[PDB]
Amino acid sequence: TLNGGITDMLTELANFEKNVSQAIHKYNAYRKAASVIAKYPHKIKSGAEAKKLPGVGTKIAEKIDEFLATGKLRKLEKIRQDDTSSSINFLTRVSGIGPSAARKFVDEGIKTLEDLRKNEDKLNHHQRIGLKYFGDFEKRIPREEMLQMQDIVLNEVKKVDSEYIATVCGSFRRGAESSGDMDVLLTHPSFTSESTKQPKLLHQVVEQLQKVHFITDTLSKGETKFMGVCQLPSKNDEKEYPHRRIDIRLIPKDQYYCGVLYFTGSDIFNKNMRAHALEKGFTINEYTIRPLGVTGVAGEPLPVDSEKDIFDYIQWKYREPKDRSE
DNA sequence: CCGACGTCGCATCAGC
DNA sequence: GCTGATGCGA
DNA sequence: GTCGG
Ligand SMILES: Nc1ccn([C@H]2C[C@H](O)[C@@H](COP(=O)(O)NP(=O)(O)OP(=O)(O)O)O2)c(=O)n1
Ligand SMILES: [Mg+2]
Ligand SMILES: [Mg+2]
Ligand code: NA
Ligand code: NA
């Protein structure tokens, strides 16, 4: 982090444009600028130096000159002092509250943590839980704890059916020394892109994890995606471990390589890879890479035998998980 | 200059 | 109920 | 907010 100051500022601006302006693209511009500056291995001495990097144009260059001359940014200073903006930025921090709900709550004079705690009747289910665990969700998970959770998830999965494969993804697979949450990709021979030969394949796993008091709550639940809460077990006299977000994704087993590429991220990396795919005339999702036809209707799934194949098709040198941290 | 810019799962709401 | 759009998050 | 065409 040769350029933490700069990338923080841009992240704050990305966050502002997302939560307050509801301008998703400006949010992307910023995340991207921040990303490209983050991997640039020099201490930036000027805005013009930055302007050079793809994704850094004029406005951001100007901001970078201001930031460097003064150590701060007047645009942000203002936004920080704005009441509506501080209020909306806060609320969206609660999981399940986005930009829209955040502005709606503010309108009704609900703007603090205490206002939320006293208005639980006005929150949907996701939002109630995000609020419940507001504090725990702010904390990072050390890898060491990620290893414990892994042991458990994989052992419980083994016990339900020995043919399940569960693979930890996200920032964990990218070798991070800490993670915001746990991401778990699931496969079972009975679920392929051809047929689902067995119902309740994700449910039986959620149930099992619930039954050992690992999954403590549910944010949302479908046939293929789970979003909920989990907690490591503590011993006698130990203060409890914090509650932690867990996402579980059941992917057809023959499409594992696309699923695992997707679920490994980063979010920015995925967006850059998919963008580049389209310029090469392909669309990648979590399932497949397909060609774009002459007018762009997506052709038939191309054969994929590893993560590398997907890189090959779009003419990208392979990148190990630890290098996809954009 | 000027749109074009990643892709999908689930929750929830509106209209029928 | 179904369809399709919007919100939110992966 | 940025940039390719
Ligand atoms: N907008 C997003 C968000 C996530 N994802 C994919 C890539 C992410 O690595 C993966 C898991 O989502 P995630 O948990 O929010 N992020 P990630 O695990 O990469 O970093 P952490 O905050 O978990 O430490 O979903 C995406 O493709 N587009
Ligand atoms: Mg994660
Ligand atoms: Mg996650
Ligand atoms: Na540039
Ligand atoms: Na939120």
Side-chain angles (χ1 to χ4, degrees), chain A residues 27 31 140 169-172 174 176 178-183 247 261-268 270-271 274:
Chain A
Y27 160 77
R31 299 252 282 154
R140 326 261 319 139
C169 299
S171 56
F172 178 86
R174 300 200 311 277
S178 85
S179 295
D181 85 337
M182 168 169 282
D183 304 286
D247 296 307
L261 170 77
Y262 161 68
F263 226 19
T264 307
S266 67
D267 53 341
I268 289 171
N270 277 2
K271 169 163 171 287
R274 296 172 168 200

Side-chain angles (χ1 to χ4, degrees), chain A residues 91-98:
Chain A
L91 297 170
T92 62
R93 275 163 74 193
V94 177
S95 166
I97 306 180

